[PDB]
RNA sequence: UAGCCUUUAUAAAUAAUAAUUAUUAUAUAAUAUAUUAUAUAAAGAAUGGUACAGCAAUUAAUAUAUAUUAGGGAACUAGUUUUUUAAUAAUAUUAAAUCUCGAAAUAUUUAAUUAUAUAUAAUAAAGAGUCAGAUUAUGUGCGAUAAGGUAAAUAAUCUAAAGGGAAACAGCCCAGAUUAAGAUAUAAAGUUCCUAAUAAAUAAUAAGUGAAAUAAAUAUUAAAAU
RNA sequence: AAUAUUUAAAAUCAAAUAUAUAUAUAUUUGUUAAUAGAUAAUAUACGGAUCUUAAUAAUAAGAAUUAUUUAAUUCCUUGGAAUAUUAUAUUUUAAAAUAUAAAUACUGAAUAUCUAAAUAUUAUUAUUAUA
RNA sequence: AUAAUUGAGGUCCCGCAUGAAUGACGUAAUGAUACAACAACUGUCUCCCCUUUAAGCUAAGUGAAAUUGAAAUCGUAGUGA
RNA sequence: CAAUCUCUAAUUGGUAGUUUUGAUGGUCAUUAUCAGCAAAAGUAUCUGAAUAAGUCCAUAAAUAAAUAUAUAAAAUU
RNA sequence: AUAUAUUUUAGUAAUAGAUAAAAAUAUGUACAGUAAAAUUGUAAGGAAAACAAUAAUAACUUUCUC
RNA sequence: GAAAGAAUUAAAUUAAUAUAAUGGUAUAACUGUGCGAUAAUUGUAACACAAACGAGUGAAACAAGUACGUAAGUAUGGCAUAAUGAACAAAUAACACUGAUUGUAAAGGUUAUUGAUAACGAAUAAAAGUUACGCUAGGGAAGGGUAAUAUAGCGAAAGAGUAGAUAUUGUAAGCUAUGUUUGCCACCUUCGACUCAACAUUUCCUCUUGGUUGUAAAAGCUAAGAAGGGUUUGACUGUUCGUCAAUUAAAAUGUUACGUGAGUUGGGUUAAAUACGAUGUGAAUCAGUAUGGUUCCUAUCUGCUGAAGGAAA
RNA sequence: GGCUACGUAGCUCAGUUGGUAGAGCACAUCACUCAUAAUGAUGGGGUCACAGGUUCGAAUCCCGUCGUAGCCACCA
């Protein structure tokens, strides 16, 4: 509903920033969560405007609405407010006025997701290709079995990466603050703190 | 047009004296906005929460179990002392005065009340 | 005026610059469950909150044949069910210059030790010039993730630096001309000829692709792996 | 053969290094190409020539492009050893045997060394005449 | 009005932003004023040709000038304050 | 009266000497807070601010609260 | 029971607690305590007036008691 | 087993803080309450932080006095970071320091206090415009870069096309090229006509060819090759352009310092004169209108057009 | 920072050299009339501008602030 037009109460101008190249191997929003088939970015990290996203959504919908129990999950919201000065105006003299909403999209991230009752995968693939024709990146069809993109030419299965109880790890190799707390909890300090 | 071209300078609010550093009485160990560091052993605190040394010694940053979730800056009277000092041991104190070996000076001091 | 430069000197002078030690844990050995030594591992005294990472709280976004709160319809005889409309909850998933609960490296930075003394800091007495900067790389603000653009941050060079390379070249890659000499090591860059110097190996290309200034979505044809 | 993906060393396998060690653990490395798309005004414009190989047939050429490498090739631990190569000499019948060598690729600065000369400072001397 | 007119004259009045001695309006005459039309005329032009004289050119005599870092002073492309 | 001299006042582009900031098409110039600012400190531009400041707050809630009531004392009665 | 005199009371006014998030003295010092939101209710009361309620007691001290 | 106390643990700084925002604050810096109303006091302040100077900030300690607290102790205003202004000249007090011959005085000094210079390190007590009649010293304290726009192309194809997205058409969004427009940057300080044109091809005509239920024919439409040759004359306007008239096989689009002023012109743009409308108190002014109106050059080199001499043939 | 002199009713204005709530003015009802309205009469609201003293007795004098502005000072 509000993914292409956030309702920040205090509307305000924003700096340009940069699209996060996720050097640490994030895989956040790079996985199929809601649907069966999806459309992910394949190229270098890119900014997608609100209008472009809307058009992609519309393109996808043409295939989704005919389906029985058809659904489209829009995975990303255009949260960054972009202002622009005109091409007509000189440089300097303040910042330009609000123009459009935009989203910073890392390399591996999923944009859309679909799942119908009577949805064959070929149709879904076609729809997602047609959606990609309207967006500024280069995109890729992603199924539930197809594995998570991280880099431009690199891949990963989330099933593989290890599970860890971090409290236990902390206890094993404790910080100074934690040790101080533990000492405080002990009786030769707790009795004589005198509050 | 109307531009937002106005800002105060930076308040120089780092630590002004470091761990293991020799100090003198009066010297500022920390400038800060509110007690990020609390005044520890042999150390005072000012109006602007500025930690300053009460005695000559060695600046030490530490945690104390009595005050968990609070960082401290204190001044150890020597380099030998671990400055979160043992609680039930006697306080390491500085006399900090000198006897008036000079006779006249001693006499003057005796006279003065 | 300070910053940076110069001259002459001063010491109960190393205070300077660089690194190490400093911590945590493990194993072994020796003393009294602790201490010391040895070895190994760990981005390893103190200060920090950027990258990264994250969705906690704040601010934002999405979904539920899930629950509650009311509303609009609807079927039988005000009660009731369903298809729901919003809010709230629950569960799952997401991001931000002014969010950071996790969190680097570089950094700031302390003592002693070692190494730099044909070397540094500090102080004293005196002379300046300069206050139009430029480019390259990285991280940003503005611009349109435009400018040989603009604004500052860090480093280098040019400025004021000749020499070799980059065809030619202020700012790039090497390297700092006291005067020669030209045997030996070379730097960056090169070795068919122009032009100082070359031979091999294994693959791929057939397009003069390309051969020191890489042009995109997409299409076609192959090639591998499943 | 056919259909449909992916173009990957994360997983997986293979290979190598480091800790107890014929194994385990940890780390490091290995996963497409071509063409089209293609484009303006003095004149082709990799700096230019020119470079893509070919038996018969050479004491002889066969990328001068792209990618990964080496300094003849293969094992052992920069070094030695073996292997064939190449060149040469000797002996025997243009070939065979023996042995010697080459294997340090090279060019390259106003860099460094060497080789000499000058000035300045530091530290030692020698000669001649605040010695 | 012209084959055809952003010009000219006539007329209309959302006069962006006329107006009465910073005078208002309509005429006769005048004007090397400005714009437009008709007639006549023509080398203005279609489209230039021929001719004449003074230069230009050559020989003799006299004899400038601005300019000038030094010049042994080509094209193209590239580079580059 | 008026004229002249001396003093005093009004008026003056008549006339003379001067000036017309730095930044911009009325707005910005001093101070504070955050971001920009890249985990010390500092850090700019006609950069972004739901930006904020030229202050505000005081002489006041008092007095009374142990020898007391008739009579007699004054070792506390 | 009633008259006069002399007194006494009635000026009727909130805090009764070291008060603790209604409003009021904004700098000192001493002593003490904890807010808010949301939720469930309740006369007018309704989304929005007020009041109530809404985390855990292991160990310790004293008291009574099987 | 029960009651009461002491409390501890968890949570919380989301409330509250005189006031912005940030940091801090429950050990509370927040809140209540007693006393008080004092420390919102007086002389010396080292040493630090910050820092060009001027200033700014924290502050141990010594001495005098005060308030609260049993005491320990705490208080030199406010949880902190804003809340501001130099000298000079005046003014008011206190000080007992100087007292221009001596004594008084005046006047000056010391100490405390006063009002502003916001262009906020403040030039004076006190200062606005105009010039196209201008003057001097200097500085530059279309080309180049860019490609948002513009022009052209490509991919994908919603949708028109009597039916069929792709004969022809092709929304909004996607990927490029160009340097032909309007911009931006600031390294770098004249429009049109005439004359002669050279080059490009993204081709308007002519030649060849593919597609065209939308090629029967003929006219077309669209696309590929193709730059050999050719591609206008008039009315209006300074105009390029545009409107129209009459033609043409066609009347293509650019580049060349938007080719060409040491080749011509000078209508536009343009200074001095003048008027009009508007603006201004005015001098005068204008992304206004109108009439008038100033540059010249014998060619040294390059280059090109022709013509000779010398030369090695 | 000091010094003035003014601020009555919804409108306008008296009153002022003391022993006062008064006027016509626009506004709503009756009235003469064929029907308006001019004219005749109904009544209307003032803390005599916030707010204190001297005379049994001040809207008027002595004023505590409030307001309109005006003036001086300071203007370095
Ligand atoms: Mg992120
Ligand atoms: Mg700051
Ligand atoms: Mg200087
Ligand atoms: Mg040292
Ligand atoms: Mg930040
Ligand atoms: Mg943190
Ligand atoms: Mg840093
Ligand atoms: Mg400068
Ligand atoms: Mg200069
Ligand atoms: Mg620059
Ligand atoms: Mg210079
Ligand atoms: Mg240098
Ligand atoms: Mg050079
Ligand atoms: Mg040198
Ligand atoms: Mg080529
Ligand atoms: Mg190239
Ligand atoms: Mg691996
Ligand atoms: Mg070319
Ligand atoms: Mg080359
Ligand atoms: Mg040398
Ligand atoms: Mg007409
Ligand atoms: Mg005409
Ligand atoms: Mg007009
Ligand atoms: Mg008149
Ligand atoms: Mg007149
Ligand atoms: Mg005349
Ligand atoms: Mg020559
Ligand atoms: Mg004048
Ligand atoms: Mg911060
Ligand atoms: Mg900062
Ligand atoms: Mg910082
Ligand atoms: Mg806070
Ligand atoms: Mg410093
Ligand atoms: Mg100073
Ligand atoms: Mg406070
Ligand atoms: Mg307080
Ligand atoms: Mg002055
Ligand atoms: Mg005298
Ligand atoms: Mg100024
Ligand atoms: Mg100033
Ligand atoms: Mg002035
Ligand atoms: Mg004029
Ligand atoms: Mg250009
Ligand atoms: Mg259709
Ligand atoms: Mg389009
Ligand atoms: Mg063509
Ligand atoms: Mg036909
Ligand atoms: Mg031909
Ligand atoms: Mg031109
Ligand atoms: Mg010329
Ligand atoms: Mg006029
Ligand atoms: Mg004339």
From Swiss-Prot, chain A:
It is found in: Mitochondrion. Signal peptide: none annotated. Disulfide bonds: none annotated. GO terms for biological process: mitochondrial translation. GO terms for cellular component: mitochondrial inner membrane; mitochondrial large ribosomal subunit; mitochondrion. GO terms for molecular function: rRNA binding; structural constituent of ribosome. Its main location: mitochondrion. The keyword Ribonucleoprotein applies. Keywords: Mitochondrion, Ribonucleoprotein, Ribosomal protein, Transit peptide. The keyword Transmembrane helix does not apply. It comes from the Eukaryota. Belongs to the universal ribosomal protein uL16 family. Component of the mitochondrial large ribosomal subunit (mt-LSU). Mature yeast 74S mitochondrial ribosomes consist of a small (37S) and a large (54S) subunit. The 37S small subunit contains a 15S ribosomal RNA (15S mt-rRNA) and 34 different proteins. The 54S large subunit contains a 21S rRNA (21S mt-rRNA) and 46 different proteins. Present with 2900 molecules/cell in log phase SD medium. Component of the mitochondrial ribosome (mitoribosome), a dedicated translation machinery responsible for the synthesis of mitochondrial genome-encoded proteins, including at least some of the essential transmembrane subunits of the mitochondrial respiratory chain. The mitoribosomes are attached to the mitochondrial inner membrane and translation products are cotranslationally integrated into the membrane. This is Large ribosomal subunit protein uL16m. It comes from Saccharomyces cerevisiae (strain ATCC 204508 / S288c). The chain holds residues 38 to 232 of 232 of the full protein.
Curated annotation (Swiss-Prot), chain B:
GO terms for biological process: mitochondrial cytochrome c oxidase assembly; mitochondrial translation. Keywords: Mitochondrion, Ribonucleoprotein, Ribosomal protein, Transit peptide. It comes from the Eukaryota. It is found in: Mitochondrion. The keyword Mitochondrion applies. Its main location: mitochondrion. The keyword Cytoplasm does not apply. Component of the mitochondrial ribosome (mitoribosome), a dedicated translation machinery responsible for the synthesis of mitochondrial genome-encoded proteins, including at least some of the essential transmembrane subunits of the mitochondrial respiratory chain. The mitoribosomes are attached to the mitochondrial inner membrane and translation products are cotranslationally integrated into the membrane. This is Large ribosomal subunit protein bL27m. The lineage of its organism: Eukaryota, Fungi, Dikarya, Ascomycota, Saccharomycotina. The gene is MRP7.
């Amino acid at each position: 509903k509000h993914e292409y037009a956030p309702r920040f109460k205090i509307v305000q101008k924003k700096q340009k920033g940069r699209v996060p190249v996720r050097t640490g191997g994030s895989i956040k929003g790079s996985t199929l969560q809601f649907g069966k088939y999806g459309l992910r970015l394949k190229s270098e990290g890119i900014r997608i405007s609100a209008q472009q996203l809307k058009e992609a959504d519309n393109a996808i919908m043409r295939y989704v609405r005919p389906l029985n129990n058809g659904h489209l999950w829009r995975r990303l919201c255009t949260n960054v407010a972009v202002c622009i000065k005109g091409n007509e105006t000189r440089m300097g003299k303040g910042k330009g006025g609000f123009d459009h909403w935009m989203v910073r999209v890392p390399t591996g991230k999923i944009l859309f997701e679909i799942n119908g009752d009577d949805l064959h995968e070929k149709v879904a693939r076609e729809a997602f290709r047609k959606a990609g024709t309207k967006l500024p990146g280069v995109y890729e069809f992603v199924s539930l079995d197809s594995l998570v993109r991280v880099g431009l030419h690199s891949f990963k299965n989330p099933k593989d990466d290890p599970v860890k109880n971090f409290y236990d790890e902390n206890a094993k190799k404790p910080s100074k603050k934690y040790l101080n707390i533990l000492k405080s909890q002990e009786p030769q300090y707790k009795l004589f703190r005198g509050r | 047009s109307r531009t937002s071209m106005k800002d105060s300078a930076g308040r120089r609010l780092g630590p002004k004296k470091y761990e293991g550093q020799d100090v003198s009485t009066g010297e500022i160990i920390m400038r800060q906005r509110g007690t990020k560091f609390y005044p520890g052993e042999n150390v005072g605190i000012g109006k602007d929460h500025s930690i300053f040394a009460l005695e000559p010694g060695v600046v030490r940053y530490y945690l104390d179990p009595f005050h968990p979730k609070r960082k401290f800056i204190g001044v150890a009277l020597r380099r030998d002392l671990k400055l979160p000092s043992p609680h039930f041991e006697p306080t390491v104190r500085r006399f900090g005065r000198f006897e008036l070996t000079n006779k006249r000076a001693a006499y003057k001091e005796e006279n003065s009340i």
